[PDB]
Design an enzyme around this catalytic site. Structure first.
Site, PDB file in Angstrom:
ATOM      1  N   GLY A  12       0.800  -1.214   0.000  1.00 63.01           N
ATOM      2  CA  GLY A  12       0.000   0.000   0.000  1.00 63.01           C
ATOM      3  C   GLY A  12       0.835   1.267   0.000  1.00 63.01           C
ATOM      4  N   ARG A  95     -17.031   5.659   9.281  1.00 59.62           N
ATOM      5  CA  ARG A  95     -16.014   5.288  10.259  1.00 59.62           C
ATOM      6  C   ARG A  95     -16.429   4.049  11.047  1.00 59.62           C
ATOM      7  NH1 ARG A  95     -14.751   7.609  14.175  1.00 59.62           N
ATOM      8  NH2 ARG A  95     -12.460   7.673  14.146  1.00 59.62           N
ATOM      9  N   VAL A 126      -0.675   2.217  12.983  1.00 60.01           N
ATOM     10  CA  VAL A 126      -0.947   3.313  12.061  1.00 60.01           C
ATOM     11  C   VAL A 126      -2.349   3.178  11.472  1.00 60.01           C
ATOM     12  CG1 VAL A 126      -0.244   4.406   9.878  1.00 60.01           C
ATOM     13  CG2 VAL A 126       1.488   3.623  11.490  1.00 60.01           C
ATOM     14  N   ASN A 128      -6.186   2.837  10.639  1.00 65.98           N
ATOM     15  CA  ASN A 128      -7.307   3.436  11.365  1.00 65.98           C
ATOM     16  C   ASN A 128      -8.455   2.464  11.615  1.00 65.98           C
ATOM     17  OD1 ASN A 128      -6.378   6.087  11.841  1.00 65.98           O
ATOM     18  ND2 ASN A 128      -6.778   6.623   9.704  1.00 65.98           N
ATOM     19  N   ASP A 156      -0.567  13.978  13.423  1.00 68.41           N
ATOM     20  CA  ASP A 156      -1.330  15.115  13.945  1.00 68.41           C
ATOM     21  C   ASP A 156      -0.374  16.120  14.576  1.00 68.41           C
ATOM     22  OD1 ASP A 156      -3.816  13.742  13.380  1.00 68.41           O
ATOM     23  OD2 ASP A 156      -3.472  12.576  15.203  1.00 68.41           O
ATOM     24  N   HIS A 184      -6.901   9.680  17.614  1.00 66.50           N
ATOM     25  CA  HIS A 184      -6.564  10.054  16.246  1.00 66.50           C
ATOM     26  C   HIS A 184      -7.846  10.098  15.425  1.00 66.50           C
ATOM     27  CE1 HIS A 184      -4.321  10.641  12.601  1.00 66.50           C
ATOM     28  NE2 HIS A 184      -4.888   9.579  12.053  1.00 66.50           N
TER      29      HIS A 184
HETATM   30  N1  LIG Z   1      -2.458   7.337  12.048  1.00 68.16           N
HETATM   31  C1  LIG Z   1      -2.310   8.177  11.010  1.00 68.16           C
HETATM   32  O1  LIG Z   1      -1.870   9.277  11.293  1.00 68.16           O
HETATM   33  C2  LIG Z   1      -2.647   7.720   9.610  1.00 68.16           C
HETATM   34  C3  LIG Z   1      -3.306   6.531   9.331  1.00 68.16           C
HETATM   35  N2  LIG Z   1      -3.599   6.149   8.080  1.00 68.16           N
HETATM   36  C4  LIG Z   1      -4.262   4.847   7.919  1.00 68.16           C
HETATM   37  O2  LIG Z   1      -3.279   3.890   7.497  1.00 68.16           O
HETATM   38  C5  LIG Z   1      -3.925   2.807   6.826  1.00 68.16           C
HETATM   39  C6  LIG Z   1      -3.217   2.471   5.521  1.00 68.16           C
HETATM   40  O3  LIG Z   1      -3.302   3.572   4.617  1.00 68.16           O
HETATM   41  P1  LIG Z   1      -2.733   3.442   3.115  1.00 68.16           P
HETATM   42  O4  LIG Z   1      -1.359   2.825   3.148  1.00 68.16           O
HETATM   43  O5  LIG Z   1      -2.948   4.765   2.420  1.00 68.16           O
HETATM   44  O6  LIG Z   1      -3.748   2.369   2.484  1.00 68.16           O
HETATM   45  P2  LIG Z   1      -3.645   1.365   1.231  1.00 68.16           P
HETATM   46  O7  LIG Z   1      -5.034   0.846   0.936  1.00 68.16           O
HETATM   47  O8  LIG Z   1      -2.851   2.045   0.135  1.00 68.16           O
HETATM   48  O9  LIG Z   1      -2.770   0.144   1.802  1.00 68.16           O
HETATM   49  C7  LIG Z   1      -3.297  -0.748   2.775  1.00 68.16           C
HETATM   50  C8  LIG Z   1      -2.651  -2.104   2.548  1.00 68.16           C
HETATM   51  O10 LIG Z   1      -2.988  -2.981   3.619  1.00 68.16           O
HETATM   52  C9  LIG Z   1      -3.187  -4.280   3.067  1.00 68.16           C
HETATM   53  N3  LIG Z   1      -3.968  -5.140   3.979  1.00 68.16           N
HETATM   54  C10 LIG Z   1      -5.308  -5.258   4.076  1.00 68.16           C
HETATM   55  N4  LIG Z   1      -5.631  -6.167   5.034  1.00 68.16           N
HETATM   56  C11 LIG Z   1      -4.482  -6.636   5.559  1.00 68.16           C
HETATM   57  C12 LIG Z   1      -4.095  -7.615   6.597  1.00 68.16           C
HETATM   58  N5  LIG Z   1      -5.047  -8.286   7.290  1.00 68.16           N
HETATM   59  N6  LIG Z   1      -2.774  -7.811   6.823  1.00 68.16           N
HETATM   60  C13 LIG Z   1      -1.816  -7.147   6.140  1.00 68.16           C
HETATM   61  N7  LIG Z   1      -2.100  -6.249   5.183  1.00 68.16           N
HETATM   62  C14 LIG Z   1      -3.387  -5.963   4.850  1.00 68.16           C
HETATM   63  C15 LIG Z   1      -3.813  -4.045   1.702  1.00 68.16           C
HETATM   64  O11 LIG Z   1      -3.582  -5.142   0.815  1.00 68.16           O
HETATM   65  C16 LIG Z   1      -3.123  -2.766   1.257  1.00 68.16           C
HETATM   66  O12 LIG Z   1      -1.999  -3.032   0.408  1.00 68.16           O
HETATM   67  C17 LIG Z   1      -5.364   3.251   6.613  1.00 68.16           C
HETATM   68  O13 LIG Z   1      -6.182   2.565   7.566  1.00 68.16           O
HETATM   69  C18 LIG Z   1      -5.372   4.741   6.886  1.00 68.16           C
HETATM   70  O14 LIG Z   1      -6.634   5.200   7.378  1.00 68.16           O
HETATM   71  C19 LIG Z   1      -3.248   6.897   7.026  1.00 68.16           C
HETATM   72  C20 LIG Z   1      -2.588   8.108   7.179  1.00 68.16           C
HETATM   73  C21 LIG Z   1      -2.224   8.634   8.487  1.00 68.16           C
END
Ligand SMILES: NC(=O)C1=CN([C@@H]2O[C@H](COP(=O)(O)OP(=O)(O)OC[C@H]3O[C@@H](n4cnc5c(N)ncnc54)[C@H](O)[C@@H]3O)[C@@H](O)[C@H]2O)C=CC1
Ligand SMILES: NC(=O)C1=CN([C@@H]2O[C@H](COP(=O)(O)OP(=O)(O)OC[C@H]3O[C@@H](n4cnc5c(N)ncnc54)[C@H](O)[C@@H]3O)[C@@H](O)[C@H]2O)C=CC1
Lengths: 331, 335
Positions: A12, A95, A126, A128, A156, A184
């Site tokens: 991802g 959500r 990380v 959400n 944040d 968050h």
């Molecule tokens: N805490 C924070 O400040 C932030 C949190 N996030 C969160 O981070 C998460 C990831 O965001 P992105 O990388 O943009 O999403 P993305 O959709 O590009 O990547 C997520 C990846 O996780 C994989 N995945 C799904 N289920 C899984 C499992 N059971 N085990 C291992 N991998 C699995 C998917 O195949 C995908 O490649 C989201 O939930 C987003 O809301 C994003 C930005 C900031």
């Protein structure tokens, strides 16, 4: 010996960004790293593409790569874990639905950490909803403890730093003692009522440089809504800045913070915390970290009525998410 | 005083990867940087999002960001330019097929560099076809010179190191003097006939550790097809590894190569280069770079018959691409 670092959701956008920085030495410096990369089966073709790219970087610090869809292999002997992987937010997904969908994921990963990872593993959540996902993983990690877990509010926090620095017209490293309390989510509490800025001679309180209306109004909404704004602009996640924040969080957690430096970290609430937060959730506090990697909540802060109310609201939300999460797991 | 660094196509995959690394200090160290980010109008919405993310990183080394769709603003007083902006190939085509879509970009950008950038600007062309796009840009930059221009074969080079290291079974920093000659294309010449490998018991020639037929066959095809292989796997560009290569290329070009190291760089062919290549194209050579940032083609290399034939084949392709490019540009100019 090389350090074993796990990134879930490795194919991802956040996982991708994080992998190359860790591989090239941004986290552990000269120490060699073995990257564990976990994905779900449909993403494994792409993940092998990521592994090709990693080889194509010729980074001497990368001692090995373990790309898998098997949790037992992914979590084995891991020292550091970035739990980024999560179910994707489709268009129109609320959500609440995301919370239910991810609850099972972090139950599984909590168990996997407990059974396979090193007992000293440092786990940063990380994906959400981060605070609640972290709560779930920890709840299902009986061989681990509160010290092994945290949830990321560091994005944040960095956002707050960047914005207040720009508002004040100062370089970012002249801003100090910023805090983001609680969840968050949009109930997060970006709090600069303790923050200072460097002047010619000494420091100046941010509250003396800017008006209350801004600090408690416009500024708060700006930071709370920033994630949505980036998404709206890019049509994609805040990948590089999130990966950066995760690295900053983990670096400070592993090696400690400099004297005077505060970092916001979502951590298990201890009963002895001096801000009246009840135990039973993961809650972001201003923290320091000593050279042993032990987290300490900053004490002695005067909480004004506005901050107090915001802190209470976000606690109430965290409690709500927990109860919602426990119910869906009960089935 | 901060250094002004331009990245074109800054909202896209490679541009996005490159932006944060430069902003955080990976290129110029502790020296402050002002990023110039150029996009086309449709991508400006996304680019402002990238700019938000840059602020949200709180990197002390980032002194400023200029995000725009106006080349005059974007190229103004720039010291370093990464010409990434361009259409990528997808899902599987030739880099020369992008020539029609991308040639005109480098004609415009060559003129913009000449008129608006510092005359000392260092320009790395990443956008494909890189060698020919670099030629076009230089041809349209009357104020500048060959010293201002190069095209990226550093990803081919880094791929070659990574792959030969894996095959030899040694760490990547134990391999030395790899070369990729010619065009960034299927006719590139991944050449390890001069390469050495360090082991516990000493340094040896790669040719003495692996059979000639592997080195001139399987290895060559693997590296030549690697770009397409990654694209096929990810369903997307080799973003992070390309950004890494671009940063490696520029770092070595600006600060010089470490003693004993060769790096592959697509450069204007100088009259009296050691290897018989005709002037008039951008050709990848094994190069060193001194502390003054001056590029030097490595001399005195023994070129075996296989390498020679490959070098001639890739030169032939570059000449063909040049004539195709000029024809395409003339057609576009006259509708
Ligand atoms: N805490 C924070 O400040 C932030 C949190 N996030 C969160 O981070 C998460 C990831 O965001 P992105 O990388 O943009 O999403 P993305 O959709 O590009 O990547 C997520 C990846 O996780 C994989 N995945 C799904 N289920 C899984 C499992 N059971 N085990 C291992 N991998 C699995 C998917 O195949 C995908 O490649 C989201 O939930 C987003 O809301 C994003 C930005 C900031
Ligand atoms: N030399 C090498 O080793 C490599 C070269 N490439 C090449 O780099 C180029 C970019 O690849 P990606 O970033 O993956 O593509 P991408 O499609 O993700 O991004 C390209 C960006 O360029 C922008 N653009 C188009 N015309 C422009 C103009 N006149 N000025 C400024 N920006 C403009 C687009 O708006 C887009 O955001 C492609 O041509 C690709 O073939 C890619 C990988 C390695």
């Amino acid at each position: 010996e090389p350090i074993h670092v796990l990134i879930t959701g490795a194919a991802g956008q956040i996982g991708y960004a994080l992998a190359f920085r860790i591989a090239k030495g941004d986290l552990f410096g000269d120490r060699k790293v073995v990257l564990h990369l976990l994905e779900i089966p449909p993403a494994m073709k792409a993940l092998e593409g990521v592994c090709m790219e990693l080889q194509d970087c010729a980074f001497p610090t990368l001692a090995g790569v373990v790309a898998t869809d098997d949790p037992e292999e992914a979590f084995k002997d891991v020292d550091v874990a970035f739990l980024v992987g999560s179910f994707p937010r489709k268009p129109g997904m609320e959500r609440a639905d995301l919370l239910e969908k991810n609850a099972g994921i972090f139950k599984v990963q909590g168990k996997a950490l407990s059974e396979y990872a090193k007992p000293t593993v440092k786990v940063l959540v990380v994906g959400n909803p981060a605070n609640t996902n972290c709560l779930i993983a920890m709840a299902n990690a009986p061989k681990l403890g509160p010290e092994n877990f945290s949830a990321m509010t560091r994005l944040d926090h960095n956002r707050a730093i960047g914005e207040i620095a720009a508002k004040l017209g100062v370089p970012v490293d002249k801003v100090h003692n910023v805090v983001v309390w609680g969840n968050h989510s949009n109930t997060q509490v970006p709090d600069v009522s303790h923050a200072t800025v460097d002047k010619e001679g000494g420091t100046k309180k941010v509250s003396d440089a800017l008006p209350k209306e801004y600090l408690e109004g416009e500024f708060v909404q700006k930071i709370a809504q920033r994630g949505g704004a980036v998404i709206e602009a890019r049509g994609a996640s805040s990948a590089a800045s999130a990966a950066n924040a995760a690295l900053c969080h983990m670096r400070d957690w592993l090696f400690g913070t400099k004297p005077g430096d505060w970092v916001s970290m979502g951590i298990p609430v201890p009963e002895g915390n001096p801000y009246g937060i009840k135990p039973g959730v993961i809650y972001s506090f201003p923290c320091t970290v000593d050279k042993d990697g032990k987290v300490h909540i900053v004490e002695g802060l005067e909480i004004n009525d506005w901050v107090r109310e915001k802190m209470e609201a976000t606690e109430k939300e965290l409690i709500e998410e927990r109860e919602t999460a426990f119910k869906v797991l009960a089935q």
